[PDB]
Amino acid sequence: MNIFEMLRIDEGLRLKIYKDTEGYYHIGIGHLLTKSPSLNAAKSELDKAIGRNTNGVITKDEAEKLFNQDVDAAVRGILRNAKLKPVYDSLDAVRRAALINMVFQMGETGVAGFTNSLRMLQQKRWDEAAVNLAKSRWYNQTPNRAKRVITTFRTGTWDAYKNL
Ligand SMILES: [Cl-]
Ligand SMILES: [Cl-]
Ligand SMILES: [Cl-]
Ligand SMILES: [Cl-]
Ligand SMILES: [Cl-]
Ligand code: NA
Ligand code: NA
Ligand code: NA
């Protein structure tokens, strides 16, 4: 298991434009196209992202290219952020993946807003952090995914992603 496989489980893979669980246009492995309700706006975004005039459908290699960029961007979001970088630095590589997962789903600014959660993670108070992380819009709206990420923080193991 690693961050790529983890996010492939949590996000799925679709080769045509789809709406994610927020109702926003996406493609591939959880690649956000736009928060606009306009499908045409989403398709322009897609063409811009791929570099060609698509028909709203990409190949698996193209989806994996965007995914590889998006994972890279979630780390960039963490390492450039004064709140996220010290927590990441402090974590083992398995818990690092859980933090990348959150930033992939919610973005840098949103995960930086988990001030109290981040403090408990930096303190290595894993059960307390897990309780605090669940008191969120994130957990209520995507509970099974948040439970997997939270178990990863709580235990420092991949147990929530094995059998899947
Ligand atoms: Cl992009
Ligand atoms: Cl940086
Ligand atoms: Cl910052
Ligand atoms: Cl709490
Ligand atoms: Cl879920
Ligand atoms: Na998905
Ligand atoms: Na629409
Ligand atoms: Na995403």
mmCIF file of C-alpha atoms and ligand atoms in Angstrom:
data_model
loop_
_atom_site.group_PDB
_atom_site.id
_atom_site.type_symbol
_atom_site.label_atom_id
_atom_site.label_comp_id
_atom_site.label_asym_id
_atom_site.label_seq_id
_atom_site.Cartn_x
_atom_site.Cartn_y
_atom_site.Cartn_z
ATOM 1 C CA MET A 1 0.000 0.000 0.000
ATOM 2 C CA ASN A 2 1.130 3.604 -0.675
ATOM 3 C CA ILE A 3 -0.464 7.054 -1.172
ATOM 4 C CA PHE A 4 -1.210 6.341 -4.864
ATOM 5 C CA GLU A 5 -3.008 3.068 -4.183
ATOM 6 C CA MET A 6 -4.754 4.637 -1.145
ATOM 7 C CA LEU A 7 -6.190 7.521 -3.112
ATOM 8 C CA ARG A 8 -7.074 5.217 -6.045
ATOM 9 C CA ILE A 9 -9.253 3.276 -3.582
ATOM 10 C CA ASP A 10 -10.830 6.400 -2.086
ATOM 11 C CA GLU A 11 -11.410 8.255 -5.368
ATOM 12 C CA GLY A 12 -12.137 5.540 -7.927
ATOM 13 C CA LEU A 13 -11.284 5.868 -11.622
ATOM 14 C CA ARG A 14 -13.744 7.240 -14.210
ATOM 15 C CA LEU A 15 -12.736 8.106 -17.771
ATOM 16 C CA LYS A 16 -15.725 10.363 -18.496
ATOM 17 C CA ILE A 17 -16.708 13.580 -16.692
ATOM 18 C CA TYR A 18 -18.634 12.731 -13.533
ATOM 19 C CA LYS A 19 -19.894 14.557 -10.453
ATOM 20 C CA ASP A 20 -18.095 13.773 -7.196
ATOM 21 C CA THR A 21 -19.785 13.444 -3.866
ATOM 22 C CA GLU A 22 -19.921 17.262 -3.544
ATOM 23 C CA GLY A 23 -21.773 17.401 -6.865
ATOM 24 C CA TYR A 24 -18.837 19.093 -8.641
ATOM 25 C CA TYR A 25 -17.475 18.133 -12.047
ATOM 26 C CA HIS A 26 -14.465 15.788 -11.953
ATOM 27 C CA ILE A 27 -12.681 13.250 -14.116
ATOM 28 C CA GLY A 28 -10.204 10.464 -13.612
ATOM 29 C CA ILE A 29 -9.058 9.684 -10.067
ATOM 30 C CA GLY A 30 -10.765 12.524 -8.265
ATOM 31 C CA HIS A 31 -9.452 15.332 -10.480
ATOM 32 C CA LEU A 32 -11.557 18.460 -9.886
ATOM 33 C CA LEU A 33 -12.468 20.261 -13.118
ATOM 34 C CA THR A 34 -14.632 23.123 -11.795
ATOM 35 C CA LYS A 35 -17.100 24.184 -9.137
ATOM 36 C CA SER A 36 -19.205 25.814 -11.883
ATOM 37 C CA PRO A 37 -22.503 24.113 -12.738
ATOM 38 C CA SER A 38 -21.620 24.545 -16.395
ATOM 39 C CA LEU A 39 -20.608 21.304 -18.133
ATOM 40 C CA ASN A 40 -19.127 23.366 -20.922
ATOM 41 C CA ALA A 41 -16.899 25.109 -18.334
ATOM 42 C CA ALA A 42 -15.844 21.682 -17.059
ATOM 43 C CA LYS A 43 -14.976 20.481 -20.597
ATOM 44 C CA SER A 44 -12.895 23.543 -21.349
ATOM 45 C CA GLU A 45 -11.077 22.872 -18.053
ATOM 46 C CA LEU A 46 -10.512 19.286 -19.109
ATOM 47 C CA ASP A 47 -9.157 20.238 -22.501
ATOM 48 C CA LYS A 48 -6.859 22.763 -20.832
ATOM 49 C CA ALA A 49 -5.688 20.068 -18.396
ATOM 50 C CA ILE A 50 -5.022 17.394 -21.007
ATOM 51 C CA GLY A 51 -3.779 19.640 -23.786
ATOM 52 C CA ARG A 52 -6.225 18.520 -26.470
ATOM 53 C CA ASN A 53 -9.707 18.925 -27.668
ATOM 54 C CA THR A 54 -11.420 15.990 -26.006
ATOM 55 C CA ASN A 55 -14.940 14.688 -26.269
ATOM 56 C CA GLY A 56 -15.297 14.644 -22.466
ATOM 57 C CA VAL A 57 -13.586 11.251 -22.265
ATOM 58 C CA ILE A 58 -9.903 10.645 -21.499
ATOM 59 C CA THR A 59 -7.736 7.559 -21.511
ATOM 60 C CA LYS A 60 -6.475 5.701 -18.419
ATOM 61 C CA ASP A 61 -2.947 6.947 -19.051
ATOM 62 C CA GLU A 62 -4.280 10.531 -19.197
ATOM 63 C CA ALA A 63 -6.230 10.011 -15.949
ATOM 64 C CA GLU A 64 -3.082 8.653 -14.280
ATOM 65 C CA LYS A 65 -1.081 11.648 -15.529
ATOM 66 C CA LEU A 66 -3.495 14.091 -13.899
ATOM 67 C CA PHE A 67 -3.496 11.943 -10.737
ATOM 68 C CA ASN A 68 0.278 11.942 -10.539
ATOM 69 C CA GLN A 69 0.213 15.801 -10.855
ATOM 70 C CA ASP A 70 -2.522 16.086 -8.217
ATOM 71 C CA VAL A 71 -0.680 13.940 -5.667
ATOM 72 C CA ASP A 72 2.455 16.009 -6.306
ATOM 73 C CA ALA A 73 0.361 19.222 -5.837
ATOM 74 C CA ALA A 74 -1.092 18.015 -2.517
ATOM 75 C CA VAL A 75 2.448 17.579 -1.176
ATOM 76 C CA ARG A 76 3.381 21.016 -2.516
ATOM 77 C CA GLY A 77 0.353 22.370 -0.673
ATOM 78 C CA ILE A 78 1.583 20.759 2.525
ATOM 79 C CA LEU A 79 5.256 21.717 2.314
ATOM 80 C CA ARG A 80 4.571 25.394 1.436
ATOM 81 C CA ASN A 81 2.002 25.771 4.233
ATOM 82 C CA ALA A 82 3.264 27.024 7.596
ATOM 83 C CA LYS A 83 0.585 25.065 9.473
ATOM 84 C CA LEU A 84 0.781 21.772 7.608
ATOM 85 C CA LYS A 85 4.533 21.424 7.049
ATOM 86 C CA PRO A 86 5.515 20.984 10.757
ATOM 87 C CA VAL A 87 2.877 18.293 11.300
ATOM 88 C CA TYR A 88 3.904 16.382 8.154
ATOM 89 C CA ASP A 89 7.590 16.608 9.146
ATOM 90 C CA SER A 90 6.648 15.138 12.482
ATOM 91 C CA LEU A 91 4.811 12.134 11.044
ATOM 92 C CA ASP A 92 5.895 8.676 9.917
ATOM 93 C CA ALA A 93 5.407 7.868 6.206
ATOM 94 C CA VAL A 94 2.053 6.046 6.706
ATOM 95 C CA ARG A 95 0.533 8.989 8.589
ATOM 96 C CA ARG A 96 2.102 11.311 6.044
ATOM 97 C CA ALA A 97 -0.066 9.538 3.414
ATOM 98 C CA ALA A 98 -3.185 10.161 5.526
ATOM 99 C CA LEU A 99 -2.396 13.887 5.570
ATOM 100 C CA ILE A 100 -1.772 13.940 1.807
ATOM 101 C CA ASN A 101 -5.149 12.166 1.363
ATOM 102 C CA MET A 102 -6.951 14.899 3.306
ATOM 103 C CA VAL A 103 -5.266 17.673 1.300
ATOM 104 C CA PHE A 104 -6.066 15.894 -1.966
ATOM 105 C CA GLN A 105 -9.746 15.790 -0.978
ATOM 106 C CA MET A 106 -10.120 19.183 0.681
ATOM 107 C CA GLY A 107 -7.107 21.307 -0.376
ATOM 108 C CA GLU A 108 -4.356 22.960 1.622
ATOM 109 C CA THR A 109 -6.320 25.852 3.049
ATOM 110 C CA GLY A 110 -9.116 23.619 4.254
ATOM 111 C CA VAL A 111 -6.895 21.063 6.011
ATOM 112 C CA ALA A 112 -4.878 23.876 7.568
ATOM 113 C CA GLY A 113 -8.128 24.963 9.248
ATOM 114 C CA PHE A 114 -8.069 21.783 11.371
ATOM 115 C CA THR A 115 -5.960 23.645 13.963
ATOM 116 C CA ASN A 116 -6.837 21.540 16.961
ATOM 117 C CA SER A 117 -6.643 18.277 15.024
ATOM 118 C CA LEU A 118 -3.182 19.224 13.711
ATOM 119 C CA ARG A 119 -1.950 20.005 17.214
ATOM 120 C CA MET A 120 -3.040 16.607 18.516
ATOM 121 C CA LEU A 121 -1.315 14.878 15.572
ATOM 122 C CA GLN A 122 1.901 16.849 16.249
ATOM 123 C CA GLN A 123 1.605 15.762 19.901
ATOM 124 C CA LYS A 124 1.239 12.064 18.814
ATOM 125 C CA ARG A 125 -2.025 11.846 20.776
ATOM 126 C CA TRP A 126 -3.477 9.512 18.183
ATOM 127 C CA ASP A 127 -6.746 8.438 19.795
ATOM 128 C CA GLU A 128 -7.520 12.034 20.793
ATOM 129 C CA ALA A 129 -6.703 13.273 17.263
ATOM 130 C CA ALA A 130 -8.983 10.606 15.788
ATOM 131 C CA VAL A 131 -11.877 11.751 18.001
ATOM 132 C CA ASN A 132 -11.305 15.354 17.079
ATOM 133 C CA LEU A 133 -10.984 14.706 13.317
ATOM 134 C CA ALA A 134 -14.444 13.094 13.283
ATOM 135 C CA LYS A 135 -16.091 16.282 14.626
ATOM 136 C CA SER A 136 -16.141 17.828 11.178
ATOM 137 C CA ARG A 137 -18.203 18.427 8.078
ATOM 138 C CA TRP A 138 -15.619 16.149 6.348
ATOM 139 C CA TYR A 139 -16.479 13.096 8.463
ATOM 140 C CA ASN A 140 -20.237 13.632 8.331
ATOM 141 C CA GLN A 141 -20.331 14.019 4.565
ATOM 142 C CA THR A 142 -17.863 11.220 3.675
ATOM 143 C CA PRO A 143 -17.859 8.972 6.770
ATOM 144 C CA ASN A 144 -16.491 5.728 5.349
ATOM 145 C CA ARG A 145 -13.573 7.510 3.662
ATOM 146 C CA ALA A 146 -12.920 9.689 6.711
ATOM 147 C CA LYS A 147 -13.035 6.587 8.933
ATOM 148 C CA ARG A 148 -10.327 4.978 6.761
ATOM 149 C CA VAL A 149 -8.110 8.081 6.871
ATOM 150 C CA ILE A 150 -8.704 8.502 10.614
ATOM 151 C CA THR A 151 -7.818 4.837 11.281
ATOM 152 C CA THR A 152 -4.607 5.426 9.347
ATOM 153 C CA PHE A 153 -3.773 8.363 11.642
ATOM 154 C CA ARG A 154 -4.854 6.471 14.741
ATOM 155 C CA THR A 155 -2.817 3.332 14.065
ATOM 156 C CA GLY A 156 -0.009 4.210 11.674
ATOM 157 C CA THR A 157 -0.907 1.078 9.716
ATOM 158 C CA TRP A 158 -2.639 0.361 6.407
ATOM 159 C CA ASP A 159 -5.286 -1.834 8.060
ATOM 160 C CA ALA A 160 -8.212 0.283 6.780
ATOM 161 C CA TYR A 161 -7.067 -0.226 3.164
ATOM 162 C CA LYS A 162 -6.278 -3.970 3.323
ATOM 163 C CA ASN A 163 -9.112 -6.307 2.076
ATOM 164 C CA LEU A 164 -9.883 -3.498 -0.308
HETATM 165 CL CL CL B 1 -4.613 20.497 -14.021
HETATM 166 CL CL CL B 2 7.929 24.674 -0.618
HETATM 167 CL CL CL B 3 1.191 29.266 5.131
HETATM 168 CL CL CL B 4 -12.086 16.477 20.520
HETATM 169 CL CL CL B 5 -17.542 7.974 2.317
HETATM 170 NA NA NA B 6 -15.065 8.992 -6.208
HETATM 171 NA NA NA B 7 -24.856 21.134 -14.621
HETATM 172 NA NA NA B 8 -9.020 16.099 -5.646
#
